[PDB]
Amino acid sequence: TLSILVAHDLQRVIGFENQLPWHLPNDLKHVKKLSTGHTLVMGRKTFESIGKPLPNRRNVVLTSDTSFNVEGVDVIHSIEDIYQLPGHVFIFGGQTLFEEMIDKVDDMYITVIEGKFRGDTFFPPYTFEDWEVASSVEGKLDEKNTIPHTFLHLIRK
Template identity: 70%
Template sequence: MLSIIVCHDKNRVIGFENKMPWHLPNDLKRVKALTTGNTIVMGRKTYESLGKALPNRKNVVLTRDKSFQPEDAEVIHNIDDIYDLKGHVFVFGGQNFYEQMIDKVDDMYVTVIEESYPGDAFFPEYTFKDFKVLSIEEGVLDEKNTIPHHFMHLERYKND
């Protein structure tokens, strides 16, 4: 299974100056719940923005830089190598990687921030002609989660 996992604002912003422009613990908990025990694949800049591999899951970095060898993550240099990874694989960003994979994934786990933020990295456009909505869940607002948001699970329509 090949999935995208992403959090974007209402204008599809996913980052600004190699950081997420918001702090939303509900989204971080969801990412942890979905990806723990599985594999996440990200571009080098996304890995560097995290500062280290995320625990309790296989971290894979896609980069053209043959000298890039982090101690806590596996490295692949060809996008097609993603298909050799076992189990449930999540495309974890950033923009360029999402653009290359959006037409190839089985489903997407999307957190939508219902506000606008400044950004220089964006999630590609997608439509509900390509994906059907399996679920939409409103995010709970509290003292730590003050930004209106919702979670969607989208599945690609199969051409049967």
């Protein structure tokens, strides 16, 4: 099963200067919970931002770079390769993978971050005409998690 995993704000911002625009530990716990034991496919800039492969899942990086051979990362050089990956595969970002994949995935796990951040990278527009809300769960706030957010799971109609 092929899924998107993304956090985006009220205007679909995902990213600023190759980093997440917000500090939201609870989103990152959500990401850990969902993707542990599965596979992640991310483009090269997302990989560099994170800087290491994430533990306890297959990390797959998409890059035209044929010298890319990183310890604990599988490399693919085409979108077409994503389909040969076994198991539950999460399209992990960033902008350019989302744009390529949004029409192809079974479902999306979206954290809607309920604020308006400066961004330089966006998730593509989508409509609920196309996507059934399987679930919608308000994120709990505390002093360390102070931005309202909602976890959506959307299934393509």
